[PDB]
C-alpha cells in the first residue's frame, strides 16, 4: 500500500503480531484430548475426578484434610441424623429403651452445628446407639429413604474420627460427597500428551439448550451405577437418559465408554434381593457374572446403527485407587489406537 | 383453599382475555393495506473478517458505530475496527465456555459470561496498556444467557435459574432481583431511555419489567414454544420476538395485544436473532437454514434474502447510525452487509 499514513502502518503490524500469537495459541491446544463425563446423580463423577488428580498429577498434602475436616464432619452428622429420622419414619419400634431417650436428647442437641468437633457426650451416645440391634436392623431394613452409601464407612470408625486429634486421610477424602454448582474441569499431562476432562454437574436447567456446546469432543464417558437397581426404578431412568445421549445427532462420531461403578456393593447385595425387581424379564440364577452380563446385554441394545459405533465397557470400583489406573490405561490405549492420524 | 384460588386465577385469565379481545376492532393489515411497498432490497458483502478459530456465539456494536466485540469458543474476545479490518485487542478468558458479550455505551468496559455462572467485566483503558479484570460478579445458580450495560456503573444480567438481576459494579451484591417467572430466561433487551426492559423465556411468554421497583406489568402468551431472540422497537411502544417454531411476532405495549405474525411456508427451522432498522421499516432475522431474511415490518411480505454463510447464523446487529448490518455464524466468520 501507498495511501497508508505513518500511524496506520503501526496498526497493521500490531494486527499482524496479534494474528501470529493467536494462531500459535490456537494450534498449540488443537492437539490435546478432551474427555467429558455425564450420568445421573450419585453416579461417581467427582470420585473419579479426584482419583485422576491423585494418580496422574500428584498426591494430596497434609493441609488439605484440615479444611476437609469440616465437610467430612458435616457428611457424617447428616448421615446419622438421616438414620435417626429414618428409624422413626416408618414407625419401626426398636429395643432402644434408654437409647430412645438418648436419641431424643441427641436429636435436640443436633442443632448445635458447631462444625469444629463433636461433643464427647454426643460421640458416646452415637456409639452406644450404634450397638443397638433395632437401629442396626433398620439400617439394612428398607432401601427406600435416600441414605448415603458412605454411612456404613463413616459410622464404623467413630472411635477414630470423633476424637479432637483426628485428621482425614486419602480414603476419608475420597468418600466425601458435595454438590457444587458450575462446571468443573481438570487438566493433566499423561502419556506425553495433555488431557482435559470436564464434569457438567449442578447445571439444574434444560440440558438441550447447551449440549451443542460440546460438539465434537474426543470421547464421552458415561457413569452408570449398579448397586442402585432397587432404589426409588432409577436404572430405568438411567436407560432413558442413555438412549437420548447415544442417539444424539451431535455425537455421531465420538467413542462412548461405559463405567459401571459400585461393583463391590453389587457383589455384596446381589445375594439378598434378586434381579427380578428391576428387570421382570430376567430368568437366570442369582449369580454375579451372569447378572453383570445381563445388565450389559440389556444396556447395550439401546444403540441404533451398531455397525458405525460400538460402546466400551469396564467394571471399575472408583473408591479403590488401584483399579482406576489400569482401566484408565486401557481406555487411553484404545483412544490412542482409534486416533491414528 | 387451593381450588378456590385456581378458579379465581381462571376467572382472572378469562377477564384479561376478554378485555384484550374487546378492544381489537380492526387489524394492522387492513389499516396499512394502502401503503406503497418497499420494493426489492439487495445487500452485498463489504467485509469478511476472518480471525476466529471456532464457533462465534455473540457480538455487539460500539456506540460510535465503528468498533465491535466478538466472543467465540476458543477462549478469546476480539475487538475489531470495521473500517480497516484491524484487530485492536485480544483478551484471553479464564473460562472457555462463553455465551454472551456486551459493550459499554461509553467504550470503557466489556462484559462476558457463560457456563461458569460468572459475569466478568474488563477495563479497556488503563495506564499499563493491557486489558485486565476489573470485577467478577457471582450469585447466579445457572448459566448466564445475556447481559446489557445500563451505564458505566450498572449492568443487568439474566440466567437459566429463572431470574434477572440489576448490579452495582463497585459493590459485590445484587441490588434488585426479578423472580416472578417460570421458564428459563434466554434473551433480554433494554429500552432506549433505559427505564424498562423485556425478557423472553422457554415457557412461551414475555414479560415487561420496571427497573426502579422491579415488578412485572404485562405478560404476553402468544407463541407455541421456546423464545430464543428478542429486541425492542426503536419508538419505545412495541417490541418483536423470535422463537423456535419458525415464526417472528410483533407485540404492542400500548394496546397490550398482538399485531402481526411473520411466517412463510417451507421454513421449519428456528430463529436465533432479531433486530430492527432505524425507522422501524425493516426487520432482520437469522435462521438455522443458513440464510437471513428481511421483512417489511408493516406488510407481512418478504423483501429479500442474505445468503452468504455456510452454517447457522447465530448473532446479528445493526449500528447506531444505521449504515451497516453485521452477522456472525458457527463457521467462524463475520460479515458486514450494507
Amino acid at each position, epitope marked *: 500500500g501507498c*495511501t497508508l*499514513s*505513518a*500511524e*496506520d*502502518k*503501526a*496498526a497493521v*503490524e*500490531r494486527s499482524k*503480531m496479534i494474528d501470529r500469537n493467536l494462531r500459535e495459541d490456537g494450534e498449540k491446544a488443537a492437539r490435546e484430548v478432551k474427555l467429558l463425563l455425564l450420568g445421573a446423580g450419585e453416579s461417581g463423577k467427582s470420585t473419579i475426578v479426584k482419583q485422576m488428580k491423585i494418580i496422574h498429577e500428584a498426591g494430596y498434602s497434609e493441609e488439605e484434610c484440615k479444611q476437609y475436616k469440616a465437610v467430612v464432619y458435616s457428611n457424617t452428622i447428616q448421615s446419622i441424623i438421616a438414620i435417626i429420622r429414618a428409624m422413626g419414619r416408618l414407625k419401626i419400634d426398636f429395643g432402644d429403651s434408654a437409647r430412645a431417650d438418648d436419641a431424643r436428647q441427641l436429636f435436640v442437641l443436633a442443632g448445635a452445628a458447631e462444625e469444629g468437633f463433636m461433643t464427647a457426650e454426643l460421640a458416646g451416645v452415637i456409639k452406644r446407639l450404634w450397638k443397638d440391634s433395632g437401629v442396626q436392623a433398620c439400617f439394612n431394613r428398607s432401601r427406600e429413604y435416600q441414605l448415603n452409601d458412605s454411612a456404613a464407612y463413616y459410622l464404623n470408625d467413630l472411635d477414630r474420627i470423633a476424637q479432637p486429634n483426628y485428621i482425614p486421610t486419602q480414603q476419608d477424602v475420597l468418600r466425601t460427597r458435595v454438590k457444587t454448582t458450575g462446571i468443573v474441569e481438570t487438566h493433566f499431562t499423561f502419556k506425553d500428551l495433555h488431557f482435559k476432562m470436564f464434569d457438567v454437574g449442578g447445571q439444574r436447567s434444560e440440558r438441550k439448550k447447551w449440549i451443542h456446546c460440546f460438539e465434537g469432543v474426543t470421547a464421552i464417558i458415561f457413569c452408570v451405577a449398579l448397586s442402585d437397581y432397587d432404589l426409588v426404578n432409577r436404572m430405568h431412568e438411567s436407560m432413558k437418559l442413555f438412549d437420548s445421549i447415544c442417539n444424539n445427532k451431535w455425537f455421531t462420531d465420538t467413542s462412548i465408554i461405559l463405567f459401571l461403578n459400585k461393583k463391590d456393593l453389587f457383589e455384596e447385595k446381589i445375594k439378598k434381593s434378586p434381579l427380578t425387581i428391576c428387570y421382570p424379564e430376567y430368568a437366570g440364577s442369582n449369580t454375579y457374572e451372569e447378572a453383570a452380563a445381563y445388565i450389559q446385554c440389556q444396556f447395550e441394545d439401546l444403540n441404533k446403527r451398531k455397525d458405525t459405533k460400538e460402546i466400551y465397557t469396564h467394571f471399575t470400583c472408583a473408591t479403590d485407587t488401584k483399579n482406576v489406573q489400569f482401566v484408565f490405561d486401557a481406555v487411553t490405549d484404545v483412544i490412542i489406537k482409534n486416533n491414528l492420524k | 383453599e387451593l381450588d378456590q384460588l385456581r378458579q379465581e386465577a381462571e376467572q382472572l385469565k378469562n377477564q384479561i382475555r376478554d378485555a384484550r379481545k374487546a378492544c381489537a376492532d380492526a387489524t394492522l393489515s387492513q389499516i396499512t393495506n394502502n401503503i406503497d411497498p418497499v420494493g426489492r432490497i439487495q445487500m452485498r458483502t463489504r467485509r469478511t473478517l476472518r480471525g476466529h478459530l471456532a464457533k462465534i456465539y455473540a457480538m455487539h456494536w460500539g456506540t460510535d458505530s*465503528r*468498533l465491535l466485540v466478538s466472543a467465540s469458543q476458543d477462549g478469546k474476545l476480539i475487538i475489531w*475496527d470495521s473500517y480497516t479490518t*484491524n484487530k*485492536v485487542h485480544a483478551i484471553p478468558l479464564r473460562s472457555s465456555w462463553v455465551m454472551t458479550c456486551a459493550y459499554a455505551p461509553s467504550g470503557n468496559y466489556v462484559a462476558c459470561g457463560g457456563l461458569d455462572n460468572i459475569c466478568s467485566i474488563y477495563n479497556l483503558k488503563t*495506564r*499499563e*496498556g*493491557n486489558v485486565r479484570v476489573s470485577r467478577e460478579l457471582a450469585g447466579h445458580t445457572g448459566y448466564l444467557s445475556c447481559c446489557r450495560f445500563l451505564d458505566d456503573n450498572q449492568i443487568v444480567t439474566s440466567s437459566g435459574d429463572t431470574t434477572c438481576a440489576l448490579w452495582d459494579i463497585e459493590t459485590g451484591q445484587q441490588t434488585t432481583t426479578f423472580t416472578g417467572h417460570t421458564g428459563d430466561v434466554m434473551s433480554l433487551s433494554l429500552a432506549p431511555d433505559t427505564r424498562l426492559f423485556v425478557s423472553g423465556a422457554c415457557d412461551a411468554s414475555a414479560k415487561l419489567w420496571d427497573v426502579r421497583e422491579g415488578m412485572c406489568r404485562q405478560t404476553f402468551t402468544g407463541h407455541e414454544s421456546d423464545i430464543n431472540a428478542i429486541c425492542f422497537f426503536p419508538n419505545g411502544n412495541a417490541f418483536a420476538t423470535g422463537s423456535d417454531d419458525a415464526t417472528c411476532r410483533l407485540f404492542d405495549l400500548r394496546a397490550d395485544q398482538e399485531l402481526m405474525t411473520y411466517s412463510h411456508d417451507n421454513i421449519i427451522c428456528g430463529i436465533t436473532s432479531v433486530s430492527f432498522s432505524k425507522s422501524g421499516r425493516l426487520l432482520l432475522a437469522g435462521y438455522d437454514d443458513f440464510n437471513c431474511n428481511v421483512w417489511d415490518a408493516l406488510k407481512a411480505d418478504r423483501a429479500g434474502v442474505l445468503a452468504g454463510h455456510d452454517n447457522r447464523v447465530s448473532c446479528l446487529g445493526v449500528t447506531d447510525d444505521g449504515m451497516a448490518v453485521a452477522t456472525g455464524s458457527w463457521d467462524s466468520f463475520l460479515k458486514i452487509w450494507n
Partner: single-chain antibody
Amino acid sequence: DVQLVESGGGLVQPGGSRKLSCSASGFAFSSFGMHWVRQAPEKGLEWVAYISSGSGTIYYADTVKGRFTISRDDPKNTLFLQMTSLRSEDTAMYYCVRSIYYYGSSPFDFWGQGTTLTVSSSDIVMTQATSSVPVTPGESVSISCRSSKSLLHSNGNTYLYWFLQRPGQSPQLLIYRMSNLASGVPDRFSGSGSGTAFTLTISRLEAEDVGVYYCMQHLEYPLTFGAGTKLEL
C-alpha cells in the same frame, strides 16, 4: 506506577564510543514501541531513533544514520543505544519516550528522565514564532504554530501534538491531534485551527504553568519539532 529510570553518560574524548540504557518498570514493556529523543544545552528538541514492538521496523534521523544503533531486550526490560564516532555536536541530554499505536491511543505520553552526555573536551518545517510573551495570572493567552505542508491526511486525521516542559523537569503531553485532551490534564486547555494554521488557547491561566511549549508533527518520518515558545511572567 509507570517509571523509566536512566543511567550512564559522562565526559567522552571525541571520536570515542559509549552506550546508554533505559530500564522500564511498571507496564507491559514488550507491547510498546520506543523512541529516543534528544535536546541541546540551549536549543530545541530533535528526534533521533525509533524501534517498534517486535523490532520489525527501525528508523534513524538524517544526521546519525550509519553511526548509531538501537536495540531492545524484552525479557530483561531494557532498551539500548550504541553510539560510535562521537562528534562534538552530540553534547546533549537524551530522553526515552514510550508510545503505542492503535485506533484511539495517545502516543508520546510518558517521557521519564534524561541522562547527560558531554562529548566536548523534503522534511516538513514547523515554525513557532519563538519569543517570550509576558503574562500575568488571571488573563488568557494564545500560541501559534504554522506548518509548511498541510497536515490533514485523507482519512480525516490531522497529526499535530503539543508539549509542555516546566523548568528543570521532563516534558508532558497535553493535546494530540489538535483537540483531544490527555489523561490527567485540566480542561482549561483548548486546541483548534485549520490546515497549516494552528492555535493553542489557555483561559483563566493558573500558576505552575510557566515554561516552554513545543508543537510537533507526526505525519511522516522523520518527526520534526518547532523552535519552542516561552511563557514568562
